[PDB]
């Protein structure tokens, strides 16, 4: 029975159960290497190493956080709970390719935990640029590893993607259209198209690595009249629509949290947001050299992809005044999820704001390569993306469990991370402008008092993180059962009850036009 | 949300147990390595 | 002469090709030259530019190239 | 149930499939730096065991247990589509790395395309009957289509082998243009475009043919009703996929490449 | 138009058969708007209860004018003194009057 | 119809397909072989591939395929 | 009744507050920390040619 | 270089550098005042009880949203452009010197006459001269001559770096096989450093750069004592 | 498949001490791992 | 050929409460189990692989 | 007797109100930001350059003995 | 030129439930929306089910983003919470 | 009035202050007494007690507005613990200063510092703003 429930799942909640499993471990694992980036840097001078050990727990570090932590536990674990419920659909469009996504992944972290352990690691960033990653700068196996391991990432999410889109198209009540679906179905929808045309040309461009490598092609190599300026093309014309996969799921989340516990029945400005998504989500091709100012390409193309760049706050801005529009009258509950929601919305703000500055090429020669970009991106990931995934999995987790959170310990939790994500990451601003660069091992001495600050935040977040372990554990522990949840009647996920049955919606809902 | 009262209420000692095993989980292993890297 | 001047056909951050075509123009001047027992003065300009523009290693691996014969410019 | 969608039967397939993933990139790690195929056999042949197991499945569970409601059926059309779509995307990167690498040749070429020392095909020879190939099965699998609509067995069948017997030529003539080819995938960044993108489309063909082959079969045990055909459907779709990527070949790297 | 409006909602609690359904939509609707309902409209509701047989629906109702009332604690003191006549009438106690304020 | 596209099919495509054989049959038969040059840019050897010698590519073809050395 | 908060809260507010301040204050000062102020103000320049 | 709790951008030695300075305060104001008013407004929606609930009509409020975010941003990227061509435009340089990258150190070609190059390498920590800086000085600076328009070529002879000298308002990618092109023209004389900023390997922290200006008289008798 | 809290997880919450060691194992293992595998580095 | 789907579909409906994947009778077992030791004993043979490239 | 209060669109006055105050605040910050920060610094540079000797600046560093090649 | 089966003659399961349902206009796997009545308590809109509960959804007007959603039970019809539409299940 | 999980499809009971009229009364059983009390409320409310107008109330409903809306110490709680637990991480820090920080680089020795200090002022560093201009070059001291 356990091995045909677990291992052998053609069901959306258990399957979503496994992915918030993983990716909270993923966490565990992102947030050691996070504290040995911190450990080095918190006092002058050489802990670990020389910067090849530590750039390999950067490297990792961005690898888990990114396809391990964020993108299984919004899309795989939000995504396969709630889009099924929220529509009143029975399953996913293909519950067993469902499965497959999911058991991709431990092989996945298996292969990048191997290229760790092996030889000496890859020690390029999580970028992988040749000619730091190919075979003669980084020989032996660790950097293929790395590529095998991205290789079942982007699988899994492929296939993911086709279920999602197939699922949401074609499984909701026939009289809902596109325009009655929760904010947050949309959010996944546009992820998944963004996954689908973003992860094969990442796929692309790192197998034309894996070949210069073992194949001897010479893509990216001038001997052969290569270019390793084609590998940063591929890899950011993936990466730049991978960071708005990483918040969309996360802006879908925000607007049902705001929402909830403004006590509304719906969020301000719906196809406004509809529209934001999606302008936000074809934009994000659009743009990808942003990554690359420093690389000697042409003014006219720099002028271009600024500008281009910098269009994307006028949808994003919409978002964020939507969201005050949806508290604007509400019933405020100071819900733990609210907490976060309400973070995320000054914090994101902040961050996507030090990202308009970025977008001025002429001021990102300076900023490039630097902690203004470390601080810009971790304002947008660990106070934007966590935020939001903290909020969802606070809010949902009696759902989910059947159980409830003590509220006082999650709300000290929130004020506890707060504090230490904020000391971690505000100082990296001065740093950056200041010139410190990225990747370095060791700084010069003028540097020491924000380094020694943001490694004291980085501590506070340490706390804030175990301290998390515990909650779910004294939830668990205690067993405290849900009875009645508010506004079912515009939160179809809950009207199963806590946890829903293992089958929801056999008998579909009755919608007439 | 409502929700019924503990099935298995977990006292204020139990909690501090609880607290204090998880932090030492975390604590201990990454304190090991770190005293001792000198060593290595 | 004091260095290479602007040249309009190469506005660019990328002076790769500039380097490149001067390379190239010395030593097609300097075999024009010599053929007809010329003289390779006349070609001095192009020397100036690709020496001022060209990275040693660059210059040292072509002139190896192309006594090698495996220079794969036309010359 | 009241809703016409399919529950799928608990499945072993998806973690058979996961763990042949993990063993072939496993394995090819260990062919590329251990000096060994062992890893690589074992995750190909798990890999295979998984697809027939699978797919096998699905017609057992379309063909004989009648899930598939027309709800199911166009969900898999949308599913077949978006992979085709994905497919697009992995070779649009091989093509910008070959326009990239071609618009802008760099002086170790000799600042010239096609570079020096590089004799490309004829794209009048080989090249030219590789597309006359491809183009007439796309019109031969059009014959077998409205065969199976129109209930014709016979002629389904026969269109269908035209078809195959055209890829299997594809194949057969690239083999032959591959090892005749004077240039190699070490010669430099046209060797290397020229070796992967038309490589990757060589697998196609072979991933196409052989899904097409699986439709042979199944019509011969009479799987497919006049309406009711998805699997070659979707066979179709993916030879015209394959068909078109080749056109796109031929243009780029065969004919204005040369 | 304010005129327009107040006499929708007076007209939606005067239903001489309004069932309690159709109070509890038409309070739950009401409290949703920006603003603390005008005493006459209170009266009709309050009115209404009486016709359902349902006192505490009335205390609620009062408490709920309050509530809507925000920090402006002007608008409960002034809201019920227009509603005394009706209060006496009927023989609805405030919340006040009961110690439901505590 | 089906009748149509086997029109096409027998009619015009499978002809193209014996025209274009006839094309390549015709123009087959070897090339001289161009005098080996050991370009730098070409026989691209950074890592030993992972079969035979570590220096033969995988669809070597002695007749027209030099090795880094020239031809065997 | 009164509940965990109107029992412990004064208490938790008041040691947790004094606690904080007194260990964040030790470790910024009697450890060895080096911060690295500005010597502006605080330094006399001192030949080193 | 950069001094102890510094906030801020090192203090401009070019005149684009200058211009990125003011360009920077003129976009953080906007930033300071667009993150303010986002918070105050969190802060106004959550601190009262009064309450609306029903649905809100959202097109008149979106058309403020939408515009004044727009006309914003020409705000921004009308200055930023400027500067984006100002930096671009053609300058007549008078001295053409390249930077190779290599791991982990920087070589220096001045070929403009005679064969001049070196190579320029971290001091360590144990050789430093009393004052000098740890992790910045290098055996061999860049000489060149004051207020005069430099061009800068840059190059890697192995992996990516990357050639910054931030009080300059300067950083060039060195690529294999490239050569980028950037100006230098110091208003000032002195010691101007700068680091890789292309992550390069296990020294990457440590191959720094250091820029020496003086008059040309003092850079031309440096230039031949260096052959 | 059995149903209702506690039941739709691959992990047992029947007893809470038992469920602390797993916790503690599962997550201790994830945080512990980058630390030994920087262990494992330096003692090459 | 003759057409033989109908027996086909008697098979794969038996009320025998087997999954889809075993519902031909014991060859499929017989492959599950093949399957699976391959797919579980390679599994542990990559990480004996892990193990051995771990160290020099 | 009390008097009739205001009982309508409370929330509504309560936005614009402050929605006007945040207007009023924000052209105040860019008046004061504008002097404080951006003036000032356009300021300090005007003032240094504005009789700066770098030939007297390099003589003074090459007399405290910073330059390897003077 | 024949010898390919018909969905009459060679579907099976669900799929030949739903033909042999579609022929006779009948929609028992809620393929097809249904349409709305007038909605008042003399007309309510009628909810088949194969239980004693099922999940309603009311779009209250045309174009409304917002679906309402309940439980409507076996009983006296029920009426939407936001735009009081009536309902009542048939099991 | 028990609420029990299997309920969980039925209509409920609210306290909030936004939707003031529930669905359900807050108690549906009712003993001899409350039967003849509900009977009582079908004539004048004025002969109805103070106490049985509070037992109506209360029959409807569970929390009256004043409860439902009171305020909490739950803040203290709350502030103190994460001050606690902020407190708790200085422990962590300076483990880690005593068992896994060597010494720092020779660099931040006072003597360095001070000739730092002054060769960064013979080389002019940052004189508009940001260093040297802080120095008074006529005076030798800070300004
Ligand atoms: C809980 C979390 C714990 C806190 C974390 C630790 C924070 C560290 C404290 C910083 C204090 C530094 C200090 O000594 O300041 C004294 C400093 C001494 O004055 P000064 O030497 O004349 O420096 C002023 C510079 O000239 C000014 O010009 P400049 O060129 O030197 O520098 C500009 C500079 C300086 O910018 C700042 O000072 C940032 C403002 C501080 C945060 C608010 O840096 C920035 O651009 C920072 C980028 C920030 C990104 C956008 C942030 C959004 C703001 C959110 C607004 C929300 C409402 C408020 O005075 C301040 O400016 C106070 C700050
Ligand atoms: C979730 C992740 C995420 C998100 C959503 C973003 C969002 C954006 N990012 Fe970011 N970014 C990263 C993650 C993210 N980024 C990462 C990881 C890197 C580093 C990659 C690496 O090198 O490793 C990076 C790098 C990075 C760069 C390259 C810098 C460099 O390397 O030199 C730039 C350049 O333009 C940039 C810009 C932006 C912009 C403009 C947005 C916009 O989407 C922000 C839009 C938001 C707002 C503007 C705020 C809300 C708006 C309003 C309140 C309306 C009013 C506002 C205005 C009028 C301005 N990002
Ligand atoms: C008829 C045409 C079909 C050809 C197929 C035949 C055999 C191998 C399979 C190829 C699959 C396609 C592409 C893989 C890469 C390279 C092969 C390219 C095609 C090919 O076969 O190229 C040959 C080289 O093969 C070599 O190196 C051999 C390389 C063998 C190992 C390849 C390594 C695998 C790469 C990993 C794939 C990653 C994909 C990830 C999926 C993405 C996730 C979404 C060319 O022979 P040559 O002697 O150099 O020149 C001819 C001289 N007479
Ligand atoms: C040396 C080569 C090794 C490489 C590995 C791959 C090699 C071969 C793979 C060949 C693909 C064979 C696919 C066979 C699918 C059979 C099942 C099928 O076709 O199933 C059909 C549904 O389609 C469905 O699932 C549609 C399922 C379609 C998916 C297939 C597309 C190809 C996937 C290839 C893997 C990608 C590799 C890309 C490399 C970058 C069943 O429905 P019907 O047909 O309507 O029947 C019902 C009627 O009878 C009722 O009257
Ligand atoms: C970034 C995450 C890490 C944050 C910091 C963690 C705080 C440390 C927690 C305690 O860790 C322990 O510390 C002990 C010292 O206090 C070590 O004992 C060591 O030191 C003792 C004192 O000398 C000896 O008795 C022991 O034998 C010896 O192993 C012990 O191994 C280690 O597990
Ligand atoms: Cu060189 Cu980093
Ligand atoms: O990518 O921002
Ligand atoms: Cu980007
Ligand atoms: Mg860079
Ligand atoms: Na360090
Ligand atoms: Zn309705």
Redesign the pocket.
């Known amino acids: 029975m356990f091995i045909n429930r677990w291992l052998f799942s053609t069901n959306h909640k258990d399957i979503g159960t496994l992915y918030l499993l993983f990716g909270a471990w993923a966490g565990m694992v992102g947030t050691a290497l996070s504290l040995l980036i911190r450990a080095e840097l918190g006092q002058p001078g050489t802990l670990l190493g020389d910067d090849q050990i530590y750039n390999v727990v950067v490297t990792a570090h ?1 690898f888990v956080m ?1 396809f391990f932590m ?1 993108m299984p536990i919004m899309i795989g674990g939000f995504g396969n709970w709630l889009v099924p419920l929220m529509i009143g659909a029975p399953d996913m469009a293909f519950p067993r390719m469902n499965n497959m996504s999911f058991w991709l992944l431990p092989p996945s972290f298996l292969l990048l935990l191997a290229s760790s352990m092996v030889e000496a690691g890859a020690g390029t ?3 992988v640029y040749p000619p730091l990653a190919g075979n003669l700068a980084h020989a032996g196996a660790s950097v293929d590893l790395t590529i095998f391991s991205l290789h079942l990432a982007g699988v899994s999410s492929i296939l993911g993607a086709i279920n999602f889109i197939t699922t949401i198209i074609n499984m909701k009540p026939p009289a809902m259209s596109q325009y009655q679906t929760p904010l947050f179905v949309w959010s996944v929808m546009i992820t998944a198209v963004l996954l689908l045309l973003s992860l094969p040309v990442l796929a692309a461009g790192i197998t034309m690595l894996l070949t210069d490598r073992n194949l001897n092609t010479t893509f990216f190599d001038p001997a052969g009249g290569g270019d390793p300026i084609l590998y940063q093309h591929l890899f950011w014309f993936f ?2 629509p ?3 996969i ?2 969309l799921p ?1 802006f879908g989340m925000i607007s049902h949290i705001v929402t909830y516990y403004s006590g509304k029945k719906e969020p301000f400005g719906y196809m406004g947001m509809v529209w934001a998504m999606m302008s ?1 989500g074809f ?2 091709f659009i ?1 990808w050299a ?2 690359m ?2 690389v000697g390409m042409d003014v006219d193309t720099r002028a271009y ?2 500008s281009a ?2 269009i ?3 949808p ?6 939507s969201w005050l529009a949806t508290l604007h009258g509400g019933n405020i509950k100071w819900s733990p999820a609210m907490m976060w929601a309400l973070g995320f919305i000054f914090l ?9 500055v ?3 090429s002429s001021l ?1 020669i300076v ?4 902690y ?3 601080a ?2 971790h304002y ?2 660990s106070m ?2 966590v935020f939001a995934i903290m909020g969802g999995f606070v809010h949902w987790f009696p759902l989910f469990s059947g159980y409830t959170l003590n509220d006082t310990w999650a709300k000290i939790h929130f004020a506890i991370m707060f504090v230490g994500v904020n000391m971690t990451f505000f100082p990296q601003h001065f740093l950056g402008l200041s010139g410190m660069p ?1 990747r370095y091992s060791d700084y010069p001495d003028a540097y020491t008092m924000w380094n020694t600050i943001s490694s004291m935040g980085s501590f506070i977040s340490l706390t804030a993180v175990m301290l998390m372990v515990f909650i779910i554990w004294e939830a668990f522990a205690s067993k405290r059962e849900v009875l009645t949840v508010d506004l079912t009647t515009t939160n179809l996920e809950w009207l199963n009850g806590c946890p829903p049955p293992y089958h929801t919606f056999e008998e579909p809902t009755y919608v007439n036009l | 949300i409502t929700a019924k009262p503990a099935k298995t209420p977990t006292s204020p000692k139990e909690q501090a147990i609880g607290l204090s095993v998880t932090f030492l989980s975390f604590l201990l292993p990454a304190g090991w390595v770190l005293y001792h890297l000198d060593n290595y | 002469y004091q260095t290479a001047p602007f040249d309009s056909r190469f506005p660019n951050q990328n002076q790769t090709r500039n380097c490149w075509q001067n390379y190239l123009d010395f030593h097609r001047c300097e075999k024009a030259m010599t053929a007809k027992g010329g003289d390779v003065s006349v070609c001095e300009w192009y020397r100036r530019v690709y020496k001022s523009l060209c990275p040693i290693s660059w210059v040292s691996t072509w002139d190896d190239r192309r006594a090698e014969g495996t220079f794969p410019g036309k010359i | 149930q009241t809703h016409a969608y399919h529950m799928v039967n608990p499945s072993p397939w998806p973690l058979t499939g996961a763990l042949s993933a993990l063993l072939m990139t496993s394995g090819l790690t260990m062919w590329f730096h251990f000096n060994s195929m062992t890893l690589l056999m074992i995750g190909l042949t798990t890999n295979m065991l998984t697809m027939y197991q699978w797919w096998r499945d699905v017609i057992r569970e379309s063909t004989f247990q009648g899930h598939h409601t027309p709800a199911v059926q166009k969900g898999l059309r949308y599913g077949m589509i978006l992979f085709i779509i994905s497919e697009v995307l992995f070779f649009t990167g091989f093509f910008w790395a070959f326009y990239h690498s071609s618009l802008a040749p760099t002086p170790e070429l000799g600042g010239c395309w096609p570079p020096t020392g590089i004799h490309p095909l004829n794209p009048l020879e080989v090249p030219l009957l590789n597309t006359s190939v491809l183009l007439a099965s796309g019109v031969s699998i059009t014959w077998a289509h409205h065969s199976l609509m129109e209930g014709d067995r016979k002629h389904m069948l026969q269109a269908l082998f035209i078809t195959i017997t055209l890829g299997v030529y594809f194949t057969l003539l690239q083999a032959s243009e591959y090892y005749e080819a004077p240039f190699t995938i070490s010669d430099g960044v046209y060797g290397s475009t020229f070796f992967v993108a038309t490589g990757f489309h060589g697998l196609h063909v072979i991933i196409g043919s052989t899904f097409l082959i699986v439709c042979f079969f199944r019509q011969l045990k009479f799987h497919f009703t006049s309406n009711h055909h998805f699997g070659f459907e979707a066979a179709a779709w993916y030879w015209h996929f394959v068909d078109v990527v080749w056109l796109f070949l031929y243009v780029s790297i065969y004919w204005w490449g040369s | 138009t304010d005129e327009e409006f107040d006499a929708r909602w007076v007209t939606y609690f005067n239903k001489p058969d309004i069932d309690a359904w159709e109070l509890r939509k038409g309070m739950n609707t009401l409290v949703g708007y920006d603003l603390v309902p005008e005493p006459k409209i209170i009266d009709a509701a309050l009115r209404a209860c009486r016709r359902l047989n349902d006192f505490a629906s009335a205390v609620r109702i009062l408490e709920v004018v309050k509530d809507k009332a925000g920090p402006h604690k002007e608008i409960y003191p002034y809201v019920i003194q227009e509603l005394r006549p009706t209060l006496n009438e009927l023989g609805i106690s405030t919340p006040e009057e009961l110690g439901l304020d505590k | 119809g089906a009748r149509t596209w086997r029109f096409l099919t027998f009619g015009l495509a499978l002809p193209s397909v014996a025209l274009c054989t006839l094309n390549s049959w015709l123009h087959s038969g070897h090339r001289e072989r161009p005098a080996f040059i050991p370009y730098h840019h070409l026989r691209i050897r950074t890592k030993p591939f992972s079969w035979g010698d570590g220096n033969h590519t995988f669809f070597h073809n002695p007749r027209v395929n030099p090795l880094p050395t020239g031809y065997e | 009744a009164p509940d965990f908060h109107d029992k412990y809260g004064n208490a938790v507010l008041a040691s947790g507050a004094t606690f904080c301040v007194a260990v964040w204050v030790y470790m910024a000062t009697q450890i060895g920390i080096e911060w690295n102020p500005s010597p502006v103000g605080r330094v006399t320049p001192k030949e080193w040619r | 270089m950069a001094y102890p709790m510094q906030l801020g951008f090192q203090d401009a030695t070019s005149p684009i550098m200058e211009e990125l300075l003011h360009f920077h305060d003129h976009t953080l104001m ?2 300071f005042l ?2 303010s ?2 918070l105050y407004i969190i802060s106004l929606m959550l601190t009262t009880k009064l309450t609306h609930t029903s649905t809100m009509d959202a097109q008149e409020v979106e058309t403020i ?1 939408t515009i ?3 006309i ?2 020409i705000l ?1 990227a009308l200055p930023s452009l400027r500067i984006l061509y100002m930096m671009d435009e053609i300058n007549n340089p008078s001295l053409t010197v390249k930077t190779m990258g290599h791991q982990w150190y920087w070589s220096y070609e001045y070929t403009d006459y005679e064969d001049l190059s070196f190579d320029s390498y971290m001091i360590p920590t144990s050789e430093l001269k009393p004052g000098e800086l740890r992790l910045l000085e290098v055996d061999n600076r860049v000489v060149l001559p004051m207020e005069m328009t430099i061009r800068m070529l840059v190059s890697s002879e192995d992996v990516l770096h990357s050639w910054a000298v931030p009080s300059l308002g300067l950083k060039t990618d060195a690529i294999p096989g490239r050569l980028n092109q950037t100006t230098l023209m110091s208003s000032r004389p002195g010691l101007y450093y700068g680091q890789c900023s292309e992550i390069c390997g296990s020294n990457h922290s440590f191959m720094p750069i250091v820029l020496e200006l003086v008059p040309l008289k003092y850079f031309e008798k440096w230039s031949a004592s260096m052959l | 498949y059995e149903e209702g809290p506690g039941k739709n997880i691959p992990f047992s919450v029947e007893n809470k001490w038992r469920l602390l060691a797993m916790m503690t194992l599962f997550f201790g293992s994830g945080f512990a791992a980058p630390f030994f595998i920087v262990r494992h580095q330096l003692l090459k | 050929f003759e057409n033989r789907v109908a027996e086909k579909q008697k098979l794969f409906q038996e009320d025998n409460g087997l999954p889809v994947h075993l519902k031909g009778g014991a060859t499929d077992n017989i492959l599950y189990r093949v399957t699976m030791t391959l797919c579980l004993g390679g599994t542990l043979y990559s990480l004996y692989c892990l193990g051995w490239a771990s160290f020099p | 007797a009390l008097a009739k209060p205001q009982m309508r669109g409370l929330l509504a006055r309560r936005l614009r109100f402050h929605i006007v105050g945040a207007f009023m605040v924000s052209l105040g910050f860019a008046t004061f930001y504008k002097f404080a920060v951006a003036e000032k610094r356009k300021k300090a540079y005007a003032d240094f350059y504005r009789n700066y000797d770098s030939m007297k600046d390099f003589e003074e560093m090459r007399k405290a003995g910073i330059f390897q090649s003077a | 030129g024949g010898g390919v089966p018909t969905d009459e003659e060679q579907a099976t399961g669900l799929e030949r439930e739903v033909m042999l349902a579609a022929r006779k206009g009948q929609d028992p796997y809620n393929i097809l929306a249904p349409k709305a009545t007038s909605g008042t308590k003399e007309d309510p809109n009628l909810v088949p089910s194969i239980t004693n509960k099922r999940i309603v959804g009311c779009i209250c007007e045309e174009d409304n983003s917002t679906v309402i959603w309940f439980w409507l039970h076996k009983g006296e019809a029920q009426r939407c919470p936001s735009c009081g539409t009536h309902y009542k299940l048939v099991p | 009035s028990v609420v029990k999980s299997e309920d969980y499809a039925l209509p409920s009971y609210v306290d909030r202050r936004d939707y003031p009229l529930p669905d359900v009364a807050h108690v549906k059983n009712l003993s001899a007494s409350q039967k003849a009390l509900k009977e009582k409320e079908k004539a004048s409310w004025s002969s109805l007690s103070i106490d049985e107008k509070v037992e109506l109330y209360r029959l409807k409903f569970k929390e009256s507005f004043a409860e439902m809306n009171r305020s909490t110490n739950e803040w203290k709680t709350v502030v103190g613990a994460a001050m606690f637990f902020i407190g708790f991480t200085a422990l962590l820090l300076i483990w880690e200063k005593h068992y896994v920080y060597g010494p720092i680089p020779h660099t931040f020795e006072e003597e360095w510092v001070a000739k730092q200090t002054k060769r960064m002022l013979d080389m002019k560093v940052a004189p508009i703003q940001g260093f040297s201009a802080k120095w008074d070059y006529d005076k030798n001291e800070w300004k």
């Open positions: 961005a990114i964020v960033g999580w970028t990466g730049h991978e960071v708005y990483l918040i996360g936000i934009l994000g743009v942003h990554h100012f420093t992809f600024t760049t910098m994307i706050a006028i994003t801005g919409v978002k964020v005044f994101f703000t902040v961050g996507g704001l030090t990202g308009i970025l977008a001025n990102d900023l490039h390569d630097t203004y970009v470390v810009h991106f947008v990931l934007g993306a990225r | 906007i930033v667009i993150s008013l986002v949203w004044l975010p727009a914003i941003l921004i």
